[PDB]
Amino acid sequence: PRRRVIGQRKILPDPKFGSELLAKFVNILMVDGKKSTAESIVYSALETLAQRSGKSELEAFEVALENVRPTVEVKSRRVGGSTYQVPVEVRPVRRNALAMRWIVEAARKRGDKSMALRLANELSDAAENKG
Amino acid sequence: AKQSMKAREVKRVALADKYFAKRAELKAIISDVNASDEDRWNAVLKLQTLPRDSSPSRQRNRCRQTGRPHGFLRKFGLSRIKVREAAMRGEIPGLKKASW
Amino acid sequence: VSMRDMLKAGVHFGHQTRYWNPKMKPFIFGARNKVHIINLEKTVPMFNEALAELNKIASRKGKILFVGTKRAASEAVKDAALSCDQFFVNHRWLGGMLTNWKTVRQSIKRLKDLETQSQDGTFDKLTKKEALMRTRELEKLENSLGGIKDMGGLPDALFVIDADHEHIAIKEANNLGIPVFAIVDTNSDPDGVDFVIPGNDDAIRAVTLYLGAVAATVREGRSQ
Amino acid sequence: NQYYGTGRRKSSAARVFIKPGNGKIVINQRSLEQYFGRETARMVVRQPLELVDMVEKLDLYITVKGGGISGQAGAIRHGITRALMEYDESLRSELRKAGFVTRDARQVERKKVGLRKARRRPQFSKR
Amino acid sequence: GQKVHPNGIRLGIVKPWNSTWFANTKEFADNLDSDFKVRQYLTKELAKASVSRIVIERPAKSIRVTIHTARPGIVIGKKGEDVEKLRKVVADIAGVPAQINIAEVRKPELDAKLVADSITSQLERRVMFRRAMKRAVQNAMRLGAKGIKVEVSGRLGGAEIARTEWYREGRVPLHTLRADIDYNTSEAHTTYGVIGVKVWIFKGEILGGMA
Amino acid sequence: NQRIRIRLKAFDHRLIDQATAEIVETAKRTGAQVRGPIPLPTRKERFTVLISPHVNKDARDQYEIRTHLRLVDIVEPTEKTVDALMRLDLAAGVDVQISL
Amino acid sequence: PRSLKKGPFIDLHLLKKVEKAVESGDKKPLRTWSRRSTIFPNMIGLTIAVHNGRQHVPVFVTDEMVGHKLGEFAPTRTYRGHA
Amino acid sequence: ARIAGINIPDHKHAVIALTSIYGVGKTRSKAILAAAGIAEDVKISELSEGQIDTLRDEVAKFVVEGDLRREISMSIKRLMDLGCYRGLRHRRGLPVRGQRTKTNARTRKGPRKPI
RNA sequence: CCGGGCUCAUAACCCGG
RNA sequence: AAUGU
RNA sequence: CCGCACAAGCGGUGGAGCAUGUGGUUUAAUUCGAUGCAACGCGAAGAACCUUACCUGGUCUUGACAUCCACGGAAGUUUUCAGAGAUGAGAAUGUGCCUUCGGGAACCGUGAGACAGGUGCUGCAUGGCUGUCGUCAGCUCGUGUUGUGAAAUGUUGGGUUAAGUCCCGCAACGAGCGCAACCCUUAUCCUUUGUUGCCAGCGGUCCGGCCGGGAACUCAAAGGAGACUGCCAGUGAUAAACUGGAGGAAGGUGGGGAUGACGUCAAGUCAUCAUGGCCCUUACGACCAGGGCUACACACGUGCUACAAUGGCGCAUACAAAGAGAAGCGACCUCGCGAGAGCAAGCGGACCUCAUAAAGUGCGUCGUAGUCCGGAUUGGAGUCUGCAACUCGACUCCAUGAAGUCGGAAUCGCUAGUAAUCGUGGAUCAGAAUGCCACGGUGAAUACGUUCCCGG
Ligand SMILES: [Mg+2]
Ligand SMILES: [Mg+2]
Ligand SMILES: [Mg+2]
Ligand SMILES: [Mg+2]
Ligand SMILES: [Mg+2]
Ligand SMILES: [Mg+2]
Ligand SMILES: [Mg+2]
Ligand SMILES: [Mg+2]
Ligand SMILES: [Mg+2]
Ligand SMILES: [Mg+2]
Ligand SMILES: [Mg+2]
Ligand SMILES: [Mg+2]
Ligand SMILES: [Mg+2]
Ligand SMILES: [Mg+2]
Ligand SMILES: [Mg+2]
Ligand SMILES: [Mg+2]
Ligand SMILES: [Mg+2]
Ligand SMILES: [Mg+2]
Ligand SMILES: [Mg+2]
Ligand SMILES: [Mg+2]
Ligand SMILES: [Mg+2]
Ligand SMILES: [Mg+2]
Ligand SMILES: [Mg+2]
Ligand SMILES: [Mg+2]
Ligand SMILES: [Mg+2]
Ligand SMILES: [Mg+2]
Ligand SMILES: [Mg+2]
Ligand SMILES: [Mg+2]
Ligand SMILES: [Mg+2]
Ligand SMILES: [Mg+2]
Ligand SMILES: [Zn+2]
């Protein structure tokens, strides 16, 4: 907003685990408020990744996220009065958000037959850091 | 709405009132499932004979006051153009702006 | 009042030398260190005669008014006035107080009215917020009108702590031809004064001497 | 004794008649799992007991009505929280600090003149 | 900016509904029409009366009507003579027994409608409108000790180009719900075209709502 | 036992409160057992019309009518009670219905 | 279309005119306006001048058109191409 | 399998592979599969020839394919010979059952061309 | 070339065939 | 981007 | 300095088809009106006939609509012939009512005029009503002022707000209209009234609050309590204000609504209505039938359904809110693949009906494809209203299966219970909702910040 600063909105932690990160992932992934289906898909891809690679669903998920977290950005800001593409640091929250958004974009573009499949394969790629 | 319009309407309504029973009865005849084909045929033939305006449909629910043939309310018998005024005179009993 | 009193009272002090203020080279004892020195020997006659006039004024039932905006004498002016039940302005001279007394009367009315309601206490009938507002407003009015509310009309003369700090009041009063008794210090102009006390205008002791002599005179003349 | 509380979320109402018991859950005289098609609402509603870790010791005789699955779940939770502290005051401090106690007030907007929706407007014609 | 009717805003609590009889949807439209017919007839009858207002009532399957005017005598008639001339036809259009009641306006200057009707009459009688507004507001401020606003609009002075003008005195918090405004308007015929009028009279910051 | 039942309709809740007051007291004095008038949910009809003549098409404003309800029932009412209820006549804005 | 229970429609004056014509063997074209009239078999081999808002269009009844309207064969509007 | 002429139903669930027959919508397909007492789901494969043949008989009862279209053409030609409103618009490639001709008529008129 | 964009226009420039 | 009520 | 004015988000338009409005063209006629923003799913909350103002033909001339005079007849009812109809021609028929007993009132016909009639002109002659700046924080007056005057001052400066909100300094002093507030709706608790509404605890039950009982609970509608920066801190010129904390259902305008300060656009409306003034009187008035308002090489606006596995198809099975009903809404039961048909209970409606919400969720299936995708077009045949569906209605079954696989230049909207997504109602209305207004269910991301925009 122009005039003065604002905060941000809090949301539920997932009852199944309690990973707010997962809460944000399901949210960013959800469409048309269809949260039930979204969480179903998330859990399916989560398990079919962790149980085919790594030890614990949550831990595999986390390390995968890590493996793609960025640190710098370039989106221009008119700091000098013009649209300079100055590279500035990225907020850790923003880092996570971008990581999640990107990985979900990849799963969307991965294929047609199983959303759960596409997702798990994407995150397997992420954990392996070749994706 | 020109006076001729209203004359037409009043004549129409009066006449429609005149033939109501006759037409309803012949309708009952015609629709009847088991009714003789010939009787149905004759009834249908006759129904043409009645005045065209007699049919209730040809009316129009004009505003009572202005007679404007649009924006009519049955709840009030008037065009939208008038009910706002009458409402805000507070004359329309218990009529008040809705803020819920 | 002895001249020695004026010297002790620091009446002789002077303002820092001012460019293009050559209006009053005369009437000054001297100057040094950017301090112009006042001719108190002139003060003694001027002072005593101003008192001589004021005695008659008070014997006239003369309504004096005392105006003070040099903060150092704000108390003193009120005290001398109340010593003779005379009216005063310790507060700022909000301007117009004379030239649109026509206007000011209304404010006087409203002050009276809020006083009356306070004595009714019917503020409590209103929301507490409004009542505290009402009290605030009444105080705000009393802050300035208290020293003049009682006169019911224009005074008979002005007493000025300092021809300068009280400038606007003098300006206003001159339009009516009201006499002005004023202290004029170096770098201050009698041009607007009727009766002048040559003396330092920014020393409390000088204020005290002026006001004591003045109040004694006004009290006696009023009391005949 | 009898302990009671009322709950309301969205546009739903819930009666919580609750008594020292064994934690059985009866919702409209139905099993919780039979009530909500997914554990989700079950997980959500069980939380207030979860804080107290006293999940085992009441008998729950319950109604919820109106709204939808989710609002209803929320009403169930609200009523349960109230009825519980209504049962025992001393738990109230931890309960509120634990963020259970408030009542949600958000509700819907009406449709408005010139709007298709609460906060959506027809196409503008670009100029 | 165009305004909302003062009466309508004040109608819910401060201003009475000139009619308040009950009806189902069934009778409602014709009940309204009967009220309209009667009142128009009354206005012609009451024009000499210049009655401020008329309420129509439907107690117990029978109608009733009350009229407020500047002069009780004008509207009534000696020994109640004329009132019955009206009662006949009003009971007739009403199709039901009818009765007339008259409430005197005790300070006609304080009625928006009366002020407006007077102003309009003088206008049609070629009295200078500005003088009319002057004296009217003068009376109002003298008598009510409370604000008044007034306006006029049209081919003022028979000019070839139209215009409007208005005048205010004292307080007129139209926006405040608590403030009560006697609002009305009127018509002033002109040898050329039309002239309109509108009035707002603040009388006292109500305490106690409709009660 | 004989049961008398009473419903009331009008546009003002206060008016109906007072009417009921009259209805109950008149039945109390006469000594019939009286059921306290039962409040009931009210209907509200809503409407809106274009408030502007000719082309401008926005700005329709809305209005609402609220009709309040109250109910009273009398059991084993005294005959004097019954006629006493009959005797009462309600304000023009009030609409009354009684049933046995 | 018209319910079968309801039976066919024809406009009585027209029916009388056609019955009379066939009986007489006059066989001259019949002015009319009753587009809504339905075509019947008895009127086969006949000719009818159907009004079209401006003019009565000649038409030669034949068995094929039986069961049609009379207005179906009498176009009202016109169109000859924008270009 | 070759059925109802020279048509080959693909080897999908019998009912839909049967709908593949032109002139056979889902209704007729369900009907035929019922009549044969044949589970609709079955592939076209795994059917003894006799089941195929009884299906051939079944479809025999239809009006289908070449004769279907032949009839359609006869109806439309019949319509076109009339000179009526419907026939004229039929021959003009214009909406025939009363849709606006000002706009939204492509599927009948065709892709836009310049004026 | 025509037709669409750009303006409060008409140009400039812009898009599509 | 030149000229324009 | 400010706000969907950018930035960060989400998702559309622009292409496909159709719906709808408009430009042009065309026609006997396609009735009239609205125009950057602020016309163009707009007047119109609903054109088959009527509507209807236009076209074509047929008709009338004190007249379709009102009074006034004379004159003749109760009224009215039933019925035939011509005519597309308007009308024309006849038949019997009524034959009455109050009558002071004179007649009169009733009505009806004819005749005489005076007049009637206009959707004919002017929104730049007008009133009324409406759009627009803009729910933008401003706008002015009295006295005084000082300045010779023309004036300005007030209303500027120092802090602070959503704000001319407030504090402070201050030739100005004080006032009014805007702001805020007084109002509805909404959130927690109480009193009070308990059926048609309620069932915790009683007793019985075929288990059906079914009924005995019960006034707890929920709930209904009236009336009360409830938030004040009030509290702690801190900070600030001690000011005002600002930051945090507790308490609490609700914390700092708790949310939403109404409410639109002076005035701008000779903005719009002579077609709701009003009217200056002006044009027409066998016609610019009126009646009748059919035709048009929906045409159709093209351009434009707004929209609906899409191009599919988050999906398609089948079987089973959860949870809402609000409205409308007497020529009405209409159950149960029977008939039909279906639209529907027949019989007929209840409810003016906490009682009866409309009327079983859909998204969700268990099981199964479909494997990326012009598809079990999409659905238009076209054929055939049916139901309903209505006198009457040819031009031109909606709705049902079989069969037919376009384009279309995310869409350039360019561009719209949104900050939470919002966007998005999914169902319900009502009004105009015989019949005709992809428009318009309400109602629930499910239900998010983004915000560095003020530098380029845009209007203030
Ligand atoms: Mg109709
Ligand atoms: Mg049990
Ligand atoms: Mg139920
Ligand atoms: Mg719109
Ligand atoms: Mg919705
Ligand atoms: Mg408004
Ligand atoms: Mg098919
Ligand atoms: Mg942006
Ligand atoms: Mg125009
Ligand atoms: Mg005939
Ligand atoms: Mg005659
Ligand atoms: Mg204008
Ligand atoms: Mg103009
Ligand atoms: Mg100024
Ligand atoms: Mg603001
Ligand atoms: Mg109780
Ligand atoms: Mg400090
Ligand atoms: Mg403090
Ligand atoms: Mg706290
Ligand atoms: Mg507050
Ligand atoms: Mg306000
Ligand atoms: Mg016609
Ligand atoms: Mg049109
Ligand atoms: Mg399909
Ligand atoms: Mg219906
Ligand atoms: Mg294709
Ligand atoms: Mg057909
Ligand atoms: Mg959709
Ligand atoms: Mg709908
Ligand atoms: Mg309806
Ligand atoms: Zn000094």
Side-chain angles (χ1 to χ4, degrees), chain E:
Chain E
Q2 307 203 28
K3 259 66 157 184
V4 64
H5 200 280
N7 177 28
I9 298 302
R10 295 172 171 86
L11 260 174
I13 46 182
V14 175
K15 304 297 182 184
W17 274 263
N18 288 280
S19 310
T20 47
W21 47 256
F22 189 93
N24 291 172
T25 298
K26 310 167 89 152
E27 176 68 328
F28 228 106
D30 292 83
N31 262 16
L32 291 168
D33 183 15
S34 314
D35 307 4
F36 172 91
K37 298 158 170 292
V38 181
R39 284 190 168 94
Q40 310 308 328
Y41 154 87
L42 294 180
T43 56
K44 165 60 191 60
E45 315 309 317
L46 305 171
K48 305 303 300 180
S50 80
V51 315
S52 60
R53 60 187 309 270
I54 302 171
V55 303
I56 290 182
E57 293 177 350
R58 303 181 179 283
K61 298 178 77 165
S62 61
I63 195 175
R64 193 169 46 213
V65 174
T66 299
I67 306 175
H68 312 69
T69 178
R71 291 193 297 274
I74 297 302
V75 55
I76 180 186
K78 53 189 190 291
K79 314 304 297 193
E81 173 194 348
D82 286 303
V83 58
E84 307 306 344
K85 306 172 184 177
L86 323 174
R87 204 175 70 81
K88 298 161 177 283
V89 65
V90 300
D92 184 16
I93 294 169
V96 290
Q99 176 274 7
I100 317 299
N101 308 265
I102 301 301
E104 173 259 11
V105 162
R106 191 158 295 162
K107 299 173 181 179
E109 309 94 322
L110 298 192
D111 289 345
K113 192 173 188 302
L114 295 185
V115 170
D117 289 345
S118 45
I119 297 163
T120 42
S121 64
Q122 303 141 236
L123 257 296
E124 293 163 328
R125 293 182 281 100
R126 296 189 175 179
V127 182
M128 165 39 56
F129 61 91
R130 180 53 247 189
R131 193 181 311 281
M133 304 269 290
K134 177 273 196 178
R135 64 165 80 270
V137 168
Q138 161 188 354
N139 306 327
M141 295 306 307
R142 287 185 308 87
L143 195 52
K146 210 68 72 160
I148 174 175
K149 177 181 182 179
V150 189
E151 172 166 3
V152 181
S153 316
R155 288 183 71 181
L156 308 191
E160 298 189 25
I161 306 180
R163 77 188 184 85
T164 175
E165 57 90 343
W166 64 280
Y167 174 29
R168 172 157 94 229
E169 296 298 353
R171 292 192 50 70
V172 187
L174 295 177
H175 272 92
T176 294
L177 309 166
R178 199 188 278 97
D180 51 345
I181 300 298
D182 175 8
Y183 172 77
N184 64 34
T185 69
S186 180
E187 293 177 350
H189 289 90
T190 71
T191 180
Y192 295 93
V194 178
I195 277 179
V197 180
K198 310 182 181 180
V199 174
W200 315 255
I201 298 171
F202 172 37
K203 299 181 188 174
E205 183 60 331
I206 299 290
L207 305 178
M210 76 187 305

Side-chain angles (χ1 to χ4, degrees), chain D residues 39-93:
Chain D
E39 274 286 345
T40 62
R42 319 178 207 153
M43 304 287 296
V44 168
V45 296
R46 289 184 289 252
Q47 305 288 29
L49 286 299
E50 185 268 19
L51 173 70
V52 292
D53 60 80
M54 183 161 277
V55 313
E56 184 173 16
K57 290 131 177 185
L58 274 298
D59 276 357
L60 277 65
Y61 192 109
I62 311 301
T63 76
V64 65
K65 309 168 186 178
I69 65 199
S70 177
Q72 282 177 339
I76 293 167
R77 196 189 68 236
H78 168 242
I80 292 175
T81 297
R82 279 201 147 178
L84 283 161
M85 305 193 313
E86 198 164 12
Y87 138 67
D88 198 331
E89 172 44 25
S90 75
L91 325 171
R92 192 172 218 272
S93 194

Side-chain angles (χ1 to χ4, degrees), chain A residues 52-118:
Chain A
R52 78 178 191 184
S53 282
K55 59 185 289 297
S56 300
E57 201 182 17
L58 303 81
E59 288 68 347
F61 159 78
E62 151 52 353
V63 61
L65 157 50
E66 299 176 353
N67 305 146
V68 299
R69 284 181 171 157
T71 310
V72 60
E73 60 186 358
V74 300
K75 295 174 69 64
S76 177
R77 176 66 184 184
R78 297 181 73 86
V79 183
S82 295
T83 311
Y84 298 168
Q85 292 60 4
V86 63
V88 291
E89 56 174 300
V90 184
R91 296 71 156 164
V93 176
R94 192 165 175 81
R95 291 175 63 239
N96 300 267
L98 287 166
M100 293 183 284
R101 209 172 301 157
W102 295 352
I103 54 167
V104 299
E105 276 301 326
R108 156 153 293 290
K109 191 57 187 61
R110 207 175 179 101
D112 66 334
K113 306 299 189 297
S114 173
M115 195 54 180
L117 188 54
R118 283 98 74 171

